[PDB]
Amino acid sequence: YDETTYGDQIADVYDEWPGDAGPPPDGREAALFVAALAAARPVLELGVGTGRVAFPLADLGVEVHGVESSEPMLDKLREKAAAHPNGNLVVPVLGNFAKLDLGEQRYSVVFAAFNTLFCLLGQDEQIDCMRQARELLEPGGTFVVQCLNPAGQRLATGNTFGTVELEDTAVHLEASKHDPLAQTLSAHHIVLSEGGGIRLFPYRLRYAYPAELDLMANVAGLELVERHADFERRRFDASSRYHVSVYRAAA
Amino acid sequence: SHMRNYDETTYGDQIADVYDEWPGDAGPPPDGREAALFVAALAAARPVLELGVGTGRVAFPLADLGVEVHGVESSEPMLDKLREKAAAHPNGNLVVPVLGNFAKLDLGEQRYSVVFAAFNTLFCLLGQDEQIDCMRQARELLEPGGTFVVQCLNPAGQRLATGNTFGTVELEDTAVHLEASKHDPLAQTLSAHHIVLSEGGGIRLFPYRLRYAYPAELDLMANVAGLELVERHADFERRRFDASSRYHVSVYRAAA
Amino acid sequence: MRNYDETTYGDQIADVYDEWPGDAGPPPDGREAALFVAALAAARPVLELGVGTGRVAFPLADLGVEVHGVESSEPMLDKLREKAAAHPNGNLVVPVLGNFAKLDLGEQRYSVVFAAFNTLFCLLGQDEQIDCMRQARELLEPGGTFVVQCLNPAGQRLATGNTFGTVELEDTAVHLEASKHDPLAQTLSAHHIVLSEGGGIRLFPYRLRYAYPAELDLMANVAGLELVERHADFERRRFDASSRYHVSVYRAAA
Amino acid sequence: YDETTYGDQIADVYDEWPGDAGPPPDGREAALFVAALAAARPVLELGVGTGRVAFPLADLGVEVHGVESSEPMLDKLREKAAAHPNGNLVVPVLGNFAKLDLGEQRYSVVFAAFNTLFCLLGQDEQIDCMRQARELLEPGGTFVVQCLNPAGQRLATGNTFGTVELEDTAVHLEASKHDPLAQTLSAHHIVLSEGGGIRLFPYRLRYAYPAELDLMANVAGLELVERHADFERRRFDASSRYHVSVYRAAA
Amino acid sequence: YDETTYGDQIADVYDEWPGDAGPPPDGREAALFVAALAAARPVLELGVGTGRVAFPLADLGVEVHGVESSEPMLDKLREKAAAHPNGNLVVPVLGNFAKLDLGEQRYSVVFAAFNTLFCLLGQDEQIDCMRQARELLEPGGTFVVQCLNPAGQRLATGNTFGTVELEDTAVHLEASKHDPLAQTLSAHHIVLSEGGGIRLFPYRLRYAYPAELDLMANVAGLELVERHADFERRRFDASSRYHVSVYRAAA
Amino acid sequence: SHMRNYDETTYGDQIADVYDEWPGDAGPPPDGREAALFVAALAAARPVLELGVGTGRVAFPLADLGVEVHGVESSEPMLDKLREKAAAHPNGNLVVPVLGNFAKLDLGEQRYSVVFAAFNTLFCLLGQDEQIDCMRQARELLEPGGTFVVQCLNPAGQRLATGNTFGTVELEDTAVHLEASKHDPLAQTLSAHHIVLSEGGGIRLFPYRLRYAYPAELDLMANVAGLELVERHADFERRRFDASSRYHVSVYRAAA
Numbered sequence A, D, E: 001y002d003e004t005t006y007g008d009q010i011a012d013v014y015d016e017w018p019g020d021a022g023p024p025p026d027g028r029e030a031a032l033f034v035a036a037l038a039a040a041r042p043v044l045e046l047g048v049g050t051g052r053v054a055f056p057l058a059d060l061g062v063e064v065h066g067v068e069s070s071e072p073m074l075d076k077l078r079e080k081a082a083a084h085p086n087g088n089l090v091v092p093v094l095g096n097f098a099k100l101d102l103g104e105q106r107y108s109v110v111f112a113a114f115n116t117l118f119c120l121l122g123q124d125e126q127i128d129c130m131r132q133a134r135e136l137l138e139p140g141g142t143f144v145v146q147c148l149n150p151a152g153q154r155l156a157t158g159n160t161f162g163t164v165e166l167e168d169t170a171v172h173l174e175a176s177k178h179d180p181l182a183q184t185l186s187a188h189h190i191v192l193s194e195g196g197g198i199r200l201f202p203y204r205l206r207y208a209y210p211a212e213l214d215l216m217a218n219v220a221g222l223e224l225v226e227r228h229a230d231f232e233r234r235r236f237d238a239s240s241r242y243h244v245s246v247y248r249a250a251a
Numbered sequence B, F: 001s002h003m004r005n006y007d008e009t010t011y012g013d014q015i016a017d018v019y020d021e022w023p024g025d026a027g028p029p030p031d032g033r034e035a036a037l038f039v040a041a042l043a044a045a046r047p048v049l050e051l052g053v054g055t056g057r058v059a060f061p062l063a064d065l066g067v068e069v070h071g072v073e074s075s076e077p078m079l080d081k082l083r084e085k086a087a088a089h090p091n092g093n094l095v096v097p098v099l100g101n102f103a104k105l106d107l108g109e110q111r112y113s114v115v116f117a118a119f120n121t122l123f124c125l126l127g128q129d130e131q132i133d134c135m136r137q138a139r140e141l142l143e144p145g146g147t148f149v150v151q152c153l154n155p156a157g158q159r160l161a162t163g164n165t166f167g168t169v170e171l172e173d174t175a176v177h178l179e180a181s182k183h184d185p186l187a188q189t190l191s192a193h194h195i196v197l198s199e200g201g202g203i204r205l206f207p208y209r210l211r212y213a214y215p216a217e218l219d220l221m222a223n224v225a226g227l228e229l230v231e232r233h234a235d236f237e238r239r240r241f242d243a244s245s246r247y248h249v250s251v252y253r254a255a256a
Numbered sequence C: 001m002r003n004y005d006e007t008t009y010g011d012q013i014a015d016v017y018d019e020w021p022g023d024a025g026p027p028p029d030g031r032e033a034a035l036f037v038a039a040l041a042a043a044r045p046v047l048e049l050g051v052g053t054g055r056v057a058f059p060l061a062d063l064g065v066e067v068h069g070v071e072s073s074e075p076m077l078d079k080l081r082e083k084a085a086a087h088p089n090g091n092l093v094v095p096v097l098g099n100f101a102k103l104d105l106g107e108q109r110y111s112v113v114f115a116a117f118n119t120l121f122c123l124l125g126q127d128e129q130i131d132c133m134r135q136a137r138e139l140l141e142p143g144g145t146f147v148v149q150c151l152n153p154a155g156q157r158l159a160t161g162n163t164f165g166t167v168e169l170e171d172t173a174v175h176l177e178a179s180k181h182d183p184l185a186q187t188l189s190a191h192h193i194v195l196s197e198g199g200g201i202r203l204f205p206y207r208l209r210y211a212y213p214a215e216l217d218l219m220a221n222v223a224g225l226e227l228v229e230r231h232a233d234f235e236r237r238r239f240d241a242s243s244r245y246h247v248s249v250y251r252a253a254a
């Protein structure tokens, strides 16, 4: 399992998957939230993917630099950009965001949507990444992450099998193993289709509790300034499935 | 829920050629004989209407008891199964198959001593509004004495998880029957795929959707349709109905 | 699940039994089991009930312990003979085609008779398990002991009715299990399912009849056995209610 | 168990109980919600109680007629009114709201906060009540109810026992029985104090599910106009513990 | 904890407790079941208590000998008998039914209702008791037990606290410890009253699973002849909270 | 929430005179001896510091091993119990009681070969910030060799319900120990009353509050405090720590 194998497998279907099987449908709202903080300056998406968020941002006239480790994901992105009327505002960068190498450039916002931070499989690595994000922010800037909230996510300890989504001729199931000590989720997204085809798309995450994530930020030189349930600024509480957290350079 | 092509027809269409072959808990419940006795006891020894007759799991047991049964069914393939069976049945001449949608019954002058809907058939109509319409049309088809009987999953005793679930339905030597399902406790809908995995590598999916009603609500729907509840059991063998009953069988008659 | 022998477990799983990764495979306690058994073996031969592919037999042979292995499954037995020919100590493993519900070993006696990894529970009834225990007892020498490793229902927290679970993940397949539990007949009846990236599906069915400790102990008494020690595993960790398994040692009764 | 025994017991502590033991802290918000619908005409609260909502409404210059069955609850109300700078705007009525008897008077809003409609132990009785509320609405009028939402309320079937709230020198527990058929909750709120004292305060509800409630409203001649999670108009979904529903006369 | 302390405490309330707090309301049906098996000969109730079943049997003209360890329970029995028109047919015996001592006398039925046999805290003791019951049966005789069925009882592993019953001015709660190895239930029935009154009634049970109980009977010289869910001969299955089992002397 | 009179002190004050008398699961864990052996092994020839020494359930077994112990305690009544026991104990002179709040230790020049907090004592400090401060101070009191040892509930294996719960802790012939608690999974706080109901009609309430930390988080706290983790067990007998371990015992030393 690489930094890359998530992207590699899923690239060509990431955008086609229906409902709960796909990524969350908050592209537009995410773009507004980031854009609302971005002003006229450029922003850095970590793990830009197929640009689910980047393109909505470019529609708002926001320059976005997308770091991505996956060749195949990156190709999807560049394909979509060439067809997008605003593609020129999306700047794809091949690279590993655990070890960003962006030189002089600085950003008004650095964000990681939909568990991207949790794609780095260790607390250390996540602290490194945050510290790096910090160092790329300009005076005003902020760091925005969207993360599963373990409490509200009600994660069975051990192994689990669940129904993700139904289509007319396929089902989307997920088989997974949870290690509540390492705090890791390791899983297969399974697609079963009529007449018997089976496709498996594996992923691993390391998650953090909020109190922990906030201390991680603190070590990174970040301090938390707001926390919501989603990009529409809904109230965050214990039963929130996700959180959106905004951080800024610390005193 | 993102099963964007679901008809009043696609349940039947898919399942017709295996509906009768599925073992144990995978197949329909094994109370055909009982349900026929139950309905028959209620026939003014006269013709009854099965809503969603299917392959005739109930209709043929009724024909064996000398009861005339009109079966309304929306699925071309189920109806083909039913007709193919009737030709071979020694009493098939007592089963009258009707192609049609029972949300919009059109049977003219004919009246019935019993209109029934077994095994969640009524909940196949995906709406409270539609269900009421159907009950009222049932009511209007009953003769003086007549009654309307429904067999329905009882939400309480069915202990339905909120949200999505995945479950083992039945095991065979060379295949498993699983169910993948989505429950919307507000819309009160169950939306699901019955999955059959086989030693080949083969996979067949058979989707279904239900809108369920709670007994208090269902009784109020019957009241709106001009029916009043006359009895309620756990099964067609008249076992006592209580909170932990998985299903109920309810009998309604025209209102005062 | 209508067509289940004493054979169909083995027949199906033999060529993959040894290949399945992590939790999908048999427990990785072969060496420890051998040690545990060897310590009670002395200088005499031991009888493994349902020797299978020799997951425990070969570790025993490595310790210089002679092992007679009873197995009903042609295919399992063939795996065993194949590994024995290749093993440096294969000669110390004695395979025996037979059904251990009806052992027929004549004059031979054993310093230990053991059934690992729920093998005793493969006999689908309380009656058959008693019979087998009685037979094992009658095959022990003076000193001998009878050793079983068994799932502990309490610690195993079995749901009532049907369940479906993820057993293990591989890069290109998943191992699932579909099961039915009958808490009254105390039976577990299941399919181990392997889905692979091809679209291939392989099903491997099994059936167990479990027994609660208090009940198994009574069964042993009726068979002329009395319990001497109980652990959680072959490393002699303390047995308690949340132990997923137990290892019980019985000897002939006074 | 009368229409009366809920109030009779709880009156003298209803307002003193802390946190989750007391009634919800949305009196102000309720008042605002009702007031916005009130226009220039008087409104009718069903089971006004101690005036937790009535008085906030009076602060907004809205005339409130309060119907209540419990002598002791009513006494608490009148006591608070005399002290309240706007007490004269609250009009207490002894009576059973299952059998309202208000003659010619008409209201711009009839409301029932905090499960009050659910105090009537039968679907029949609830329908009568709604029909009667309908007939007391002027032309524009609306009927507002706040009700537990069974889905979001995740009610165990059968008996349960639970912690309600903690004080320095008491605990608030709750012993209850759920009949999922009759859809009734029958309970004792229990206060154990450090003295060795025990007080019990029993209550009964019959709840309805939203789709059922709506159909009841229809039979009463009402139609649903809006539904929220609370009086601040948050969105109502499956996991909403309560709902607030606004109904108006039907076409 | 004695073989006695169950009875001693509960005697004066055993018959007064409402609903689910009381003993099951199947006394009449029990008597009918036992009478049908009784033939012309006398029957022996183990742990007769306050004669919840013995008196209904007397009403059927059946002679009942009742063994009881609890002085106070026995006193309740004798008090009811004197008042009962058929009390003369109930023969109380002070004694411990783990160690019956009835000499020459033989019975057409020996029975233990409502977990009575589970009152002996050990597999050994229970076998002994069965073997003695066997040895007291005449030729035709049968041994009858009513027992909690652990499967259908869905017993939490570990401690629990539940609501047993509700009264207008008291609640019945139960605090409990389950040892799934020893197969023991150890508990306090708790009554809290509006006074400030707390009463604790402790009990212990050792249960057996059916397969195990049947093996026990085999060791005692009994073989199982029929099993129901209750004395009305409803069908026993996994979800049956109790079972009624009828044994007879073995071949 | 509404226990608005909760000090560093009100746990101790209330429980002191029954802390040692409570049976089975209601009392503190019976691992005093084992803790003492574990700590003494790390202790070397310098004094050890117990945080929240309480009634000396661990201190006295240590003094039995000839180890000098300084016990910080905030509770007047607990300390009174401790002093009472020491006077009667053959080795009490080795136990040195200190009135103080270990969130704000003030021990001057003295240094320790071990500083430990047993049975969730560190979690008595109701905040992540306070717990770090306390770890940093412990760090600063350790000599060169020194280690800092904590015994803490492991939330994963503790399987804490989210929200409020009510449970049976222990049973006596004439009293039950129940527990009523509220769990805030965001604040990571447990707040509760231990309730004793007795045959008299008597009610005793003993309230407590914890802030727990997950191990990964606790380690990062230790890192911020200048500590690095050197070993982790499930208990003082060094059994293996895993997901289903109810507690953990963690040893930290000064960082490179």
Ligand SMILES: Nc1ncnc2c1ncn2[C@@H]1O[C@H](CSCC[C@H](N)C(=O)O)[C@@H](O)[C@H]1O
Pocket: A003, A004, A006, A007, A008, A023, A046, A047, A048, A049, A050, A051, A052, A053, A067, A068, A069, A070, A073, A095, A096, A097, A098, A113, A114, A116, A119, A120
């Ligand atoms: N270490 C790493 N460096 C760079 N990209 C990474 C990475 N680990 C994961 N990724 C990429 O980050 C993405 C996580 S998926 C999220 C895609 C996109 N942000 C969206 O919300 O739709 C994938 O495209 C994956 O290939």
Ligand SMILES: Nc1ncnc2c1ncn2[C@@H]1O[C@H](CSCC[C@H](N)C(=O)O)[C@@H](O)[C@H]1O
Pocket: B008, B009, B011, B012, B013, B028, B051, B052, B053, B054, B055, B056, B057, B058, B072, B073, B074, B075, B078, B100, B101, B102, B103, B118, B119, B121, B124, B125
């Ligand atoms: N709107 C509609 N009109 C007519 N038939 C319908 C319908 N919706 C579903 N059905 C049919 O109703 C049946 C439900 S299955 C029940 C079949 C039969 N009553 C039995 O118990 O065996 C299916 O045959 C399905 O095709």
Ligand SMILES: Nc1ncnc2c1ncn2[C@@H]1O[C@H](CSCC[C@H](N)C(=O)O)[C@@H](O)[C@H]1O
Pocket: C006, C007, C009, C010, C011, C026, C049, C050, C051, C052, C053, C054, C055, C056, C070, C071, C072, C073, C076, C098, C099, C100, C101, C116, C117, C119, C122, C123
């Ligand atoms: N009645 C019976 N007689 C003989 N062997 C049996 C049997 N029932 C099951 N078996 C065999 O017992 C084995 C159970 S698998 C256990 C194998 C081996 N002891 C190990 O631990 O790895 C299988 O080989 C199965 O084929």
Ligand SMILES: Nc1ncnc2c1ncn2[C@@H]1O[C@H](CSCC[C@H](N)C(=O)O)[C@@H](O)[C@H]1O
Pocket: D003, D004, D006, D007, D008, D023, D046, D047, D048, D049, D050, D051, D052, D053, D067, D068, D069, D070, D073, D095, D096, D097, D098, D113, D114, D116, D119, D120
């Ligand atoms: N049938 C009936 N008629 C009139 N009032 C009733 C009633 N049944 C219950 N009540 C009263 O309705 C109130 C429910 S409590 C709600 C009080 C107030 N609405 C608040 O939100 O704070 C109690 O005061 C109770 O005594």
Ligand SMILES: Nc1ncnc2c1ncn2[C@@H]1O[C@H](CSCC[C@H](N)C(=O)O)[C@@H](O)[C@H]1O
Pocket: E003, E004, E006, E007, E008, E023, E046, E047, E048, E049, E050, E051, E052, E053, E067, E068, E069, E070, E073, E095, E096, E097, E098, E113, E114, E116, E119, E120
């Ligand atoms: N070892 C023993 N010997 C005799 N009686 C016992 C006993 N252990 C318990 N008992 C008594 O048996 C009774 C169990 S309660 C059941 C009472 C009665 N059979 C009924 O159904 O209502 C109590 O009266 C208890 O005191």
Ligand SMILES: Nc1ncnc2c1ncn2[C@@H]1O[C@H](CSCC[C@H](N)C(=O)O)[C@@H](O)[C@H]1O
Pocket: F008, F009, F011, F012, F013, F028, F051, F052, F053, F054, F055, F056, F057, F058, F072, F073, F074, F075, F078, F100, F101, F102, F103, F118, F119, F121, F124, F125
């Ligand atoms: N902030 C603080 N400062 C000092 N002592 C404290 C404290 N908070 C809690 N305590 C004390 O720490 C103890 C927690 S209970 C543990 C007691 C002892 N270590 C044992 O193992 O048995 C109580 O005695 C409590 O009064």
